Subunit: 146 residues, 5 copies
């Protein structure tokens, strides 16, 4: 995937988990021959789509990373709705894969188990990056060349 | 339906169930006189809409196939929301039927029962392909000729 | 309403209830002076929006008819979400009333009770056609004439 | 506020409660010295957005009035989804305030208590009309002038 | 951030809490070198998106502030849906961060605890303003300059 132009936008709310997701995404990229993806940090998940929109103008794939954990109020629901609506719109507006590596969990324990920290069962940041690269390559093959 | 240009995009997440959906889809297409539909694989359901969008540009119908099974977190809900929002937008943007053969189940048992395996109650992949082809033929008759 | 150009698109999933809805729609149309509305059948509710979009280009109102009954899986929810998002978009894109006569029930008995059979409490097919025609006539009044 | 061009669109479903909302709306408009608002009736809440779209072309603000009361089926949910999606889209397409005076209650008593009868705790018809007028005035001040 | 043009739109439903969110927003802005953000008041949360849309034409970031507290009817859900859908669209239409500082809580107690009063656990008005400003600065760096 060495010719793929990859961007990663990672939210910061939930610093340690977000750092873990970003590390996983960056390692997949480097594993795939990309040592220099564009990496941008934003404060919360709601800020991701507008930045992803900008990044989609100059990249073949964008990986969105973040962590949303339910609390005591309906806020969780609306944060997640905004992200889903935003990322879906951006991908289709730009005809560019925007992989969703934004964790949406009920508990912190669940988020930790999915961030690819040392004891985690999985890494959604890494998975989201494979998805982004694989889709970019597939689109490259489907589009105009001769 | 021998003149209809059909594309099938299939998510890889639950590989065995996805293989089963694709088999049903392909057999329907072949029975209707189409031995060579455009078949594209993607990694996860979220990746389907952007690829479906590309395929809608030069096909009369697109069949989306995949399997989303609910787990411990709200992830299931947001994957399904993205797929719904995306496929709906793509079909209307492109004025092209995008048939939904993306299983959205609570259990693996339920998904298996709907993948048209020897013992399955039904085959969602075959059903979605019938729907895509029937709708394309209907649109052809509705539109400009002769 | 003899001057209004009416289309009716009806899904075939749950055939007898759909037939019942279509009968109610046709009777209202005839009563309002329209013996020959454009009637198109599709396989499932998900196929309605793209066909409604096509019909909206050539008609003053479209009636969407269908039956979606909840089963074992979350699939009901997303089918209904798709229908709602699609018809809403189509109505506003085309500035054309698209009446929602798509039943969304928990049981078959509920669906029967709203299909306007001899024993039914109401006829949603008839209701949706009144809604479509009334709204078309209202828009005709509000828009440019002399 | 005497120079704002106001339109009101009110659905007819639950006629008495719909009339109460409308009286509250008209009272506010008269109280603010408005030239007779454009008043349009539609059959059900789903018809409101397309008519509000037409009204927004010729008015500084639109008040949407209606009553949706939950029953036995999931249909309440999808009616409200459609209204929410439609009105939000119309407001933004037209850059015009569309005030949401559409009651969404679980019971008839709840709707009555919010419709501005002598014994009502609230008057949501009046409130929506205040919001419409205020927002129109705010926009006028924000936009281009001497 | 002294060169960023900031706008704040604040709903007046729940006056005291709104004032508190606004104070947090203004303090963050002042701390980052902005003493004079554009501040606009609206009556309800549903009015925010149309005003944010106007503000986005003339500003680098917009902070939406407000308070939606659940009551006895589903109406809370649809207000929050409208705000979520609206703000998300406005941000992407305008390619401008629209920060969501609209509290969505089950109780008045919860809203007070998130408004940054003296004994509050957090200040979401302050948080939303940091988000808006950080995202504007990020976008400035990503976009065209020499
Ligand atoms: O990445 C995130 N992850 C998050 O978990 C998050 C974020 N972001 N934001 C806010 C953020 O998305 C925006 O920056 C903010 O709304 C301003 O735009 C949140 O308010 N949250 C908290 C959502 C859950 C609310 C809760 F804290 F659990 P509560 O106890 O208030 O219900
Ligand atoms: O076809 C799928 N089928 C799926 O079941 C799926 C997919 N895809 N993706 C993610 C995938 O769609 C994207 O590739 C990813 O978000 C990157 O964009 C998932 O996270 N899932 C799992 C959703 C359910 C998560 C769960 F495992 F059940 P959990 O226990 O974490 O709640
Ligand atoms: O009119 C309908 N009415 C329907 O009830 C329907 C339809 N259509 N479709 C599918 C259909 O909308 C599309 O043709 C298909 O997805 C291909 O695009 C469905 O899958 N359904 C079934 C939804 C209910 C799910 C269930 F069958 F009960 P389950 O037990 O699998 O949850
Ligand atoms: O203003 C309304 N208020 C309403 O309460 C309403 C409306 N409209 N419509 C239908 C109507 O919006 C459209 O005219 C129709 O779908 C055709 O487009 C409804 O079906 N309803 C009722 C929703 C269904 C609830 C119920 F009838 F009680 P049920 O027991 O069937 O769940
Ligand atoms: O900022 C707000 N905060 C709010 O809490 C609010 C607002 N606004 N609006 C209405 C408002 O958004 C609009 O101005 C109105 O719909 C007209 O467009 C409301 O109806 N509410 C009340 C929502 C909850 C309703 C309830 F009071 F809990 P109920 O008991 O009626 O269900
Ligand atoms: K791109
Ligand atoms: K929790
Ligand atoms: K990691
Ligand atoms: K090619
Ligand atoms: K096509
Ligand atoms: K499960
Ligand atoms: K099969
Ligand atoms: K038309
Ligand atoms: K059932
Ligand atoms: K009937
Ligand atoms: K006129
Ligand atoms: K206007
Ligand atoms: K009830
Ligand atoms: K701007
Ligand atoms: K409460
Ligand atoms: K404060
Ligand atoms: K740059």
């Amino acid at each position: 995937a060495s010719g793929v132009r990859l961007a990663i936008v990672a939210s910061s709310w939930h610093g340690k988990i977000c750092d873990a997701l970003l590390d996983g995404a960056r390692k997949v990229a480097a594993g795939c021959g990309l040592d220099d993806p564009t990496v941008v940090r934003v404060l919360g998940a709601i800020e991701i789509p507008v930045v992803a929109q900008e990044l989609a103008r100059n990249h073949d794939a964008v990986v969105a990373l973040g962590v949303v954990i339910r609390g005591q109020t309906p806020h969780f629901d609306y944060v997640c709705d905004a992200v889903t609506q935003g990322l879906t719109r951006v991908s289709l507006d730009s005809s560019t894969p925007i992989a969703n590596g934004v964790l949406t969990t009920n508990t912190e324990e669940q988020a930790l188990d999915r961030a690819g920290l040392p004891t985690s069962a999985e890494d959604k940041g890494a998975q989201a990056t494979v998805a982004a690269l694989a889709t970019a390559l597939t689109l490259r093959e489907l589009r105009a060349h001769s």
